Design a protein around this nucleic acid. Structure first.
Ligand SMILES: [Mg+2]
Ligand SMILES: [Mg+2]
Ligand SMILES: [Mg+2]
Ligand SMILES: [Mg+2]
Ligand SMILES: [Mg+2]
Ligand SMILES: [Mg+2]
Ligand SMILES: [Mg+2]
Ligand SMILES: [Mg+2]
Ligand SMILES: [Mg+2]
Ligand SMILES: [Mg+2]
Ligand SMILES: [Mg+2]
Ligand SMILES: [Mg+2]
Ligand SMILES: [Mg+2]
Ligand SMILES: [Mg+2]
Ligand SMILES: [Mg+2]
Ligand SMILES: [Mg+2]
Ligand SMILES: [Mg+2]
Ligand SMILES: [Mg+2]
Ligand SMILES: [Mg+2]
Ligand SMILES: [Mg+2]
Ligand SMILES: [Mg+2]
Ligand SMILES: [Mg+2]
Ligand SMILES: [Mg+2]
Ligand SMILES: [Mg+2]
Ligand SMILES: [Mg+2]
Ligand SMILES: [Mg+2]
Ligand SMILES: [Mg+2]
Ligand SMILES: [Mg+2]
Ligand SMILES: [Mg+2]
Ligand SMILES: [Mg+2]
Ligand SMILES: [Mg+2]
Ligand SMILES: [Mg+2]
Ligand SMILES: [Mg+2]
Ligand SMILES: [Mg+2]
Ligand SMILES: [Mg+2]
Ligand SMILES: [Mg+2]
Ligand SMILES: [Mg+2]
Ligand SMILES: [Mg+2]
Ligand SMILES: [Mg+2]
Ligand SMILES: [Mg+2]
Ligand SMILES: [Mg+2]
Ligand SMILES: [Mg+2]
Ligand SMILES: [Mg+2]
Ligand SMILES: [Mg+2]
Ligand SMILES: [Mg+2]
Ligand SMILES: [Mg+2]
Ligand SMILES: [Mg+2]
Ligand SMILES: [Mg+2]
Ligand SMILES: [Mg+2]
Ligand SMILES: [Mg+2]
Ligand SMILES: [Mg+2]
Ligand SMILES: [Mg+2]
Ligand SMILES: [Mg+2]
Ligand SMILES: [Mg+2]
Ligand SMILES: [Mg+2]
Ligand SMILES: [Mg+2]
Ligand SMILES: [Mg+2]
Ligand SMILES: [Mg+2]
Ligand SMILES: [Mg+2]
Ligand SMILES: [Mg+2]
Ligand SMILES: [Mg+2]
Ligand SMILES: [Mg+2]
Ligand SMILES: [Mg+2]
Ligand SMILES: [Mg+2]
Ligand SMILES: [Mg+2]
Ligand SMILES: [Mg+2]
Ligand SMILES: [Mg+2]
Ligand SMILES: [Mg+2]
Ligand SMILES: [Zn+2]
Lengths: 83, 206, 60, 23
RNA sequence: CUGAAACUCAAAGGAAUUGACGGGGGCCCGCACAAGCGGUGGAGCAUGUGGUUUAAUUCGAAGCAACGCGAAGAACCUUACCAGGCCUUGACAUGCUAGGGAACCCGGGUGAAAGCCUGGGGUGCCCCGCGAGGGGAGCCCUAGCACAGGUGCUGCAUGGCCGUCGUCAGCUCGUGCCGUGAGGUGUUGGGUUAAGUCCCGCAACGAGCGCAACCCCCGCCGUUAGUUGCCAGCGGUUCGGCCGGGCACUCUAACGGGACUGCCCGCGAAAGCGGGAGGAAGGAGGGGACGACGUCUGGUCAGCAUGGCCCUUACGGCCUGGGCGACACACGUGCUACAAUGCCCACUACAAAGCGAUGCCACCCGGCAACGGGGAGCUAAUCGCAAAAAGGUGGGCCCAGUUCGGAUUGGGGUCUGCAACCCGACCCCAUGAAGCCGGAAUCGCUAGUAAUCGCGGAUCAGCCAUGCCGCGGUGAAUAC
RNA sequence: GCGGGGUGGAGCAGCCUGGUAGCUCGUCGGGCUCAUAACCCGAAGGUCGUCGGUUCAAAUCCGGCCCCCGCAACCA
């Protein structure tokens, strides 16, 4: 995984938007292209629109889903089965 | 399409490289690329003169470019003139000691890249492709050559069905390595598309 | 996507990971040898011509 | 074995090292 | 028996020529069959493909001769596909008009980045230059015109390059002769060979492209050379060719020699065939390089070249993200196995070819480990990668879905990289699936081969490599 | 009015004697072939016309309704 000795990665520009809103009190909408990011404790309760290549997917973050990456919650493929 | 390139087949036996110099792993490409940039510029200008062979030598930040040609006068210029104006043009790209010679060609008819280049011209000028080839061979042989073969592929006369026509005289033992084979290729542009010209000259064996 | 790509290939990028080799003679992105700077196709073409110093066919 | 990472023969296959093949 | 027409076709035919084919003949050959040995087809997995799915799952490849193929390295990049945000002489070449100042480096606002908006700072020359000031043009910026640009279509318009039948023994030409002519002749015929190989014969006589030879690797010997390589002898030896000393030997790498049916018996008109000797080598010594005229309207406009057709605020271009990695299924090539001629642990041997200065990294230390911090040597016959592995000695397992097999997943870490969600490799704890030798069918190999074992290299930040190109270890069975 | 019948896609067994659905072709997946057929190897699909009843249990026995085949319907 992301090497523990280094950092816990969040794209600089998005982290700021969360933290700006934290002061003011959250929450508007957050159109992002930050799949490479980590969901991070400051993000809980926000509603983030993640780009899956196609759409901006509305994801409400919870206290349970923190250590993951953002893109795990914006599916890249549409699959309904065969036949 | 099967046959081997008869030049590269003979390297280190009957034919010798046109770039004779050494370099280590970290420098080889940068020099080789210069020969590439140089040979283009040379053949961009010197095509008129009747360019036959581009030899390049190197030591350390210096290079002697020995050019073979059928009209040495058009290369050298007015009293040392054109051959000068290239020296400056040359060391502009090179950035180094550009020693540019010009050497005699003691017969364009024994020069494969020349025999081809001329035929490529004749058919750019709407000439009879069959007849022109038999002539090309007929020149080469009259100059005492041991054997000759000449090939043109493409829309001959503009024909919609592409065709490969060829002609030959004497010997051409392309399987034999102790036999000297000068090979030259010439690409003829036209209005209806491009044709390709192959020439093989058998000088004599070793 | 062609000429803009041989040209995008030389300029120094937005991150150094994105460095990819393009055959300096014809621009082939695939099969590019470090030593010559060429693609396996040009490799063979210059060589056969005898314009590759010290290069000759291997037979063993 | 040759597919079993937790063995000697297994890590020789991959060309790597560990407790199950020390260097 | 006598015997029409309407309608309808652009021919129906005769002989002979060259081919191709024959469940015709003859003579031969190729791991073609047979004789054997190991597989594939079942299983789990890696990879390519068909389908389907998808916003997109870019494109080509299609029976032998498409399918681990272009791809010798898809997270962004690559990348040609799709979504969204953007740029208009334009990411790029060669020209002119005019404006700034030339140039170049540093940061700022905004936004995912691109971009759009911005704040800095000084031009040479040669010149009237103690002075406002002026341009030429090395160059960047800016409003235009040329023109750029297109992996958009056409391999059925093309060059080039390649596959292919086929390493098969063939394909022709000049002249003469024959036939009205296509064409035949030679090239057929006897024999021989790996071969249109050589011999003998002949209205044929020669010539050419092919076969073979010339070139490389290997097997024996020699000359030359002796460090970083080697150590037979002697002497020192901290016990390591480590020092003296030497190039003898192994080797390294250039130049030669040697093999030719040359000698003998014999069968033969001959070319050759069976045998014998000498010799490291014997009848092409083993392997390689090398592929005739042509065939497949074969393959590649996506490596490149190129006619033409097509697009121009876009079929061009820049970016951020996603897709190329999808999954009811089918097929191809593979990897690892189902075990005792085996699995596992400890100790212990013997290769080769390669590779390596933000590269290989001895050695020391932290760590179960991947790795991490130290740090020496080496532009490398010196130093490193490096342990080769199957093997040998000893010990355990005891016929079990197992101490076989290592897929699937849970949990925890290392590294590369801006970034490993989709979508990398590796290490560790736990989980321990299918599979008990594979239906119809089907593949490879004739000897240092098959089978089995490890090592390297290209691409390459890392890597989905079990792929490919090589290298040595051990080493068969069988051909009536 | 009397007798017989309806079972994968087609055509027939199994019902009498209750427990267990079979045969040929066809369909689908694989193989041989350049390819198709044939041929070879595997594999899917009938909840037995319906509704009711007997039974522990009904394709099977009994009733209802439905559709089909055959025969009868004469003195008038
Ligand atoms: Mg025109
Ligand atoms: Mg192009
Ligand atoms: Mg890269
Ligand atoms: Mg590359
Ligand atoms: Mg095991
Ligand atoms: Mg094994
Ligand atoms: Mg009659
Ligand atoms: Mg006839
Ligand atoms: Mg076979
Ligand atoms: Mg057999
Ligand atoms: Mg068998
Ligand atoms: Mg099998
Ligand atoms: Mg399988
Ligand atoms: Mg697909
Ligand atoms: Mg195409
Ligand atoms: Mg076909
Ligand atoms: Mg790859
Ligand atoms: Mg991607
Ligand atoms: Mg992108
Ligand atoms: Mg991109
Ligand atoms: Mg991509
Ligand atoms: Mg073609
Ligand atoms: Mg095509
Ligand atoms: Mg072609
Ligand atoms: Mg004649
Ligand atoms: Mg006649
Ligand atoms: Mg006559
Ligand atoms: Mg004739
Ligand atoms: Mg013949
Ligand atoms: Mg003939
Ligand atoms: Mg004969
Ligand atoms: Mg042969
Ligand atoms: Mg001959
Ligand atoms: Mg004759
Ligand atoms: Mg000596
Ligand atoms: Mg003999
Ligand atoms: Mg040969
Ligand atoms: Mg075609
Ligand atoms: Mg093109
Ligand atoms: Mg074109
Ligand atoms: Mg792909
Ligand atoms: Mg299968
Ligand atoms: Mg595989
Ligand atoms: Mg398989
Ligand atoms: Mg089990
Ligand atoms: Mg990943
Ligand atoms: Mg087990
Ligand atoms: Mg089982
Ligand atoms: Mg057992
Ligand atoms: Mg087995
Ligand atoms: Mg088997
Ligand atoms: Mg059988
Ligand atoms: Mg054989
Ligand atoms: Mg490497
Ligand atoms: Mg690697
Ligand atoms: Mg993978
Ligand atoms: Mg390997
Ligand atoms: Mg029925
Ligand atoms: Mg009955
Ligand atoms: Mg019964
Ligand atoms: Mg079927
Ligand atoms: Mg069939
Ligand atoms: Mg009851
Ligand atoms: Mg029943
Ligand atoms: Mg009932
Ligand atoms: Mg009932
Ligand atoms: Mg009833
Ligand atoms: Mg009746
Ligand atoms: Zn190239």
């Amino acid at each position: 995984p992301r090497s523990l000795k280094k950092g816990v990665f969040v794209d600089d520009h998005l982290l700021e938007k969360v933290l700006e809103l934290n002061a003011k009190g959250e929450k508007r909408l957050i159109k992002t292209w930050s799949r490479r990011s980590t969901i991070v404790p400051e993000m809980v309760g926000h509603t983030i629109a993640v780009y899956n290549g196609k759409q901006h997917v509305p994801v409400y973050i919870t206290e349970n889903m923190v250590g993951h990456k953002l893109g795990e919650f914006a599916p890249t493929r549409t699959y309904r089965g065969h036949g | 399409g099967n046959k081997i390139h008869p030049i590269g087949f003979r390297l280190g036996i009957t034919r010798d490289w046109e770039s004779r110099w050494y370099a280590g792993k970290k420098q080889y490409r940068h020099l080789l690329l210069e020969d590439q940039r140089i040979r283009g510029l040379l053949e961009k200008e010197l095509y008129s003169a009747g360019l036959a062979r581009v030899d390049i030598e190197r030591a350390a930040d210096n290079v002697a470019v020995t050019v073979h040609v059928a009209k040495p006068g058009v290369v050298i210029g007015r009293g040392g003139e054109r051959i000068r104006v290239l020296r400056e043009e040359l060391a502009k790209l090179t950035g180094k000691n550009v020693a540019l010679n010009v050497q005699e060609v003691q017969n364009p008819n024994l020069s494969a890249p020349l025999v081809a280049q001329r035929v490529a011209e004749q058919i750019e000028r709407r000439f009879a492709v069959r007849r022109a080839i038999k002539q090309a061979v007929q020149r080469v042989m009259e100059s005492g050559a041991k054997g000759a073969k000449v090939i043109v592929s493409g829309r001959i006369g503009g024909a919609e069905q592409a065709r490969t026509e060829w002609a030959a005289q004497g010997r051409v033992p392309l399987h034999t390595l102790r036999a000297n084979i000068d090979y030259g290729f010439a690409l003829a542009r036209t209005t209806y598309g491009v044709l390709g010209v192959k020439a093989y000259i058998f000088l004599g064996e070793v | 996507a062609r000429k803009a790509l041989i040209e995008k290939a030389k300029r120094t990028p937005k991150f150094k990971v994105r460095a990819y080799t393009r055959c300096v003679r014809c621009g082939r992105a695939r099969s590019v040898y470090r030593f010559f700077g060429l693609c396996r196709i040009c490799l063979r073409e210059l060589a056969h011509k005898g314009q590759l110093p010290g290069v000759r066919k291997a037979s063993w | 074995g040759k597919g079993d990472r937790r063995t000697r023969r297994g890590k020789i296959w991959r060309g790597t090292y560990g407790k199950y093949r020390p260097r």
